[PDB]
């Protein structure tokens, strides 16, 4: 017997069902910002660069939902980390620069990152 009216009431078991129940009550344009899904998810690619590369992808997606032309593919939500105020301190773009890569982190993360610079902006 699953689905609660509450937030919880306690314990890992209730907690595990709860992220399933949350995804129901907001399906809309992926989870966007991953819920209690995040904990199992890292181990799913323990070998080792692939986790960061994946993580980088989600973080880029999350920033904004742009036009979505050829390699401008960022989904998730339109505003939830914006892009580009001129009063924002120390700005969004600092994280965007990582994604522009020569190899600036390692090659698996690099391939993901170049696509990801292209994708947000």
């Amino acid at each position: 017997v699953e689905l609660i009216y509450k937030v919880c009431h306690a314990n890992p078991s209730e907690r595990a069902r709860f992220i399933r129940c949350i995804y129901n009550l907001l399906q809309s344009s992926s989870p966007a910002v991953k819920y209690e899904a995040a904990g199992t998810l890292v181990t799913l690619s323990s070998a080792p660069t692939a986790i960061k590369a994946a993580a980088q992808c989600y973080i880029d997606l999350i920033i904004k939902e742009s036009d979505n032309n050829v390699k401008l593919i960022v989904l998730d939500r339109l505003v939830e980390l914006k892009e580009h105020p001129a009063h924002e301190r120390v700005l969004q773009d600092l994280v965007m620069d990582i994604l522009r890569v020569l190899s600036t982190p390692d090659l698996e993360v690099r391939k993901k990152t170049l696509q990801l610079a292209l994708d947000l902006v």
Binding site: S46, A86, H87, E88, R89, V90, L91, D93
Partner: protein
């Protein structure tokens, strides 16, 4: 002498005598090497034990992480340093580091090297990349090499402490110690450097009850630290804070201010015989090895004290173009919001006390330096002594010519024009204070708001706060709470009838005078 501290027990673990304690070079984990023949590591932030390794069945004196390889080096009474992968859980390599058990290991992240110090009176070098071949052997020490540390200004240099009453500074290139320091008089248990790019320092600890500070640049002994009232097992330098943390076999740890060597604290735990110390290089965690276990402890000062007025005097203490003892700072710069703005400091006159908290007035007429149960008021931009007062805590309110203080008599105090207000004195007790117009005082699992009119209990909110700040109209308040945040309405008229009537209970209040807006 005063210093921002707050000793906190981050994680404890009970085990047979832990000779070495370490923080993981780049990870939030701390590794302790035990006499269980096991080394164990725990990440003392989430309170999860990440992994254990059974190095030997006889004590492991030393353990450290070579973070880049994702490996841990241990040296045990196998007279071996055995290497393991701390995520693929298996023994990476096994090698004989020495002819005797390995007291300490030091890791050079920039080079493939570990040098290990052993009580075969020799320190040997091993290169992890060669599969733990013996790169270099250092012959210099004629006694039991208790500890090794790498100098952070030249990693090619390390110092080793041996119970031979010297700490010898060696270079990798040279088997022999390229110079000797005679750092102690009853053998040197430990050597440490005071970390940084501009700090040439050594420390020696000895069983003459004493820790000694040495300057390696000048070669003189800067001062002698009382250490402990029994043989100093180890001594180390904290990087950020000006203190030395020492441990002794009397089960006591003492903290000494490194500016006059007057006792900052004495800590015992019911674990006793404190063998080692080590400090995190990124600062504010020190870990100490004891007979009955290990502890990882978290030191205070996490955040700076400063305040921005309307005169562009943004005042801090410490920092650049400002001294800690005196007071200064200005910030008149408006360069782009996207980066950190320059210091932009302009000089500011006299001070007489230490800044526990140092703050400008919110509209610029006063400066307050608070410190040692006293507040001293200095004038906004002239810094002549305006006023004085008592304050274990000082907070400007909204009024900022009325302020709240904790005078620590069990009543939260208001001082107005820096002169005490006794028309303000809670019918709660006190345990702590929140500023703003209705002073929040926390007592008996309550937050009580008091009037600056007759000090009656207006209301009590049943979730205690982090803060109360009141708007500059004093009808609206913003409450920082573990709840998250409240905005409350103080209905002024309702308060005037209630307060006069004193219908508001001594410790529970009247639930009408205040109302919960959101």
């Amino acid at each position: 002498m005063p210093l921002r501290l707050d000793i906190k027990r981050k994680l404890t673990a009970r085990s047979d005598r832990v000779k070495s304690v370490d923080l993981h070079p780049t990870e939030p984990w701390m590794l302790a090497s035990l006499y269980n023949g096991s080394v164990c590591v725990w990440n003392h932030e989430t309170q999860t034990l990440v992994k254990t390794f059974e190095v030997c069945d006889l004590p492991v004196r030393a353990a450290k992480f070579v973070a880049r390889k994702n490996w841990v080096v241990t040296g045990a009474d196998d007279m071996q340093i055995r290497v393991f992968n701390y995520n693929t859980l298996e023994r990476v390599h096994m090698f004989e580091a020495h002819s005797d058990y390995i007291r300490c290991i030091a890791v050079h992240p920039t080079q493939p090297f570990i040098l290990t110090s052993s009580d075969d009176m020799l320190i040997k070098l091993w290169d992890w990349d060669k599969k733990w071949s013996c790169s270099q052997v250092f012959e210099g020490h004629t006694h039991y090499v208790m500890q090794i540390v790498i100098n952070p200004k030249d990693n090619n240099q390390f110092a080793s402490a041996s119970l031979d009453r010297t700490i010898k500074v060696w270079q990798l290139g040279s088997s022999s110690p390229n110079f000797t320091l005679e750092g102690h008089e009853k053998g040197v248990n430990c050597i440490d450097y005071y970390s940084g790019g501009d700090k040439p320092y050594l420390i020696s600890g000895a069983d003459d009850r004493l820790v000694k500070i040495w300057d390696y640049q000048n070669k003189t002994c800067v001062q002698t630290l009382e250490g402990h009232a029994q043989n100093v097992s180890c001594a180390s330098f904290h990087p950020e804070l000006p203190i030395i943390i020492t441990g002794s076999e009397d089960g006591t740890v003492r903290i000494w201010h490194s500016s006059t060597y007057r006792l900052e604290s004495t800590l015992n735990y019911g674990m006793e015989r404190v063998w080692c110390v080590a400090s995190l290089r990124g600062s504010n965690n020190v870990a100490l090895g004891y007979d009955e276990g290990s502890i990882i402890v978290k030191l205070g000062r996490e955040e700076p004290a400063m305040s921005m007025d309307a005169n562009g005097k943004i005042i801090w203490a410490k920092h650049s173009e400002v001294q800690q003892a005196n007071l200064k700072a200005m910030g008149d710069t408006e360069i782009k919001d996207g980066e950190r703005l320059p210091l932009a400091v302009k000089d500011m006159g006299s001070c007489e006390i230490y800044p526990q908290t140092i703050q400008h007035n919110p509209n610029g007429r006063f400066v307050v330096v608070c410190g040692d149960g006293e507040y001293i008021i200095y004038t906004a931009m002239a810094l002549r002594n305006k006023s004085f007062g008592s304050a274990q805590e000082f907070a400007w309110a909204h009024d900022s010519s009325e302020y709240a203080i904790r005078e620590s008599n069990s009543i939260v105090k208001i001082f107005k024009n820096f002169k005490e207000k006794k028309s303000f004195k809670p019918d709660f007790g006190a345990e702590s204070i929140y500023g703003g117009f209705l002073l929040g005082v926390r007592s008996v699992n309550g937050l009580a708001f008091y009037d600056w009119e007759n000090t009656e209990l207006i209301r009590r909110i049943e979730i205690q706060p982090k803060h109360i700040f009141w708007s500059d109209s004093g009808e609206l308040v913003c409450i920082a709470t573990e709840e998250s945040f409240f905005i409350l309405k103080y209905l002024s008229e309702k308060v005037l009838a209630a307060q006069e009537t004193h219908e508001g209970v001594t410790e529970d209040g009247i639930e009408d005078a205040f109302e919960v807006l959101g």
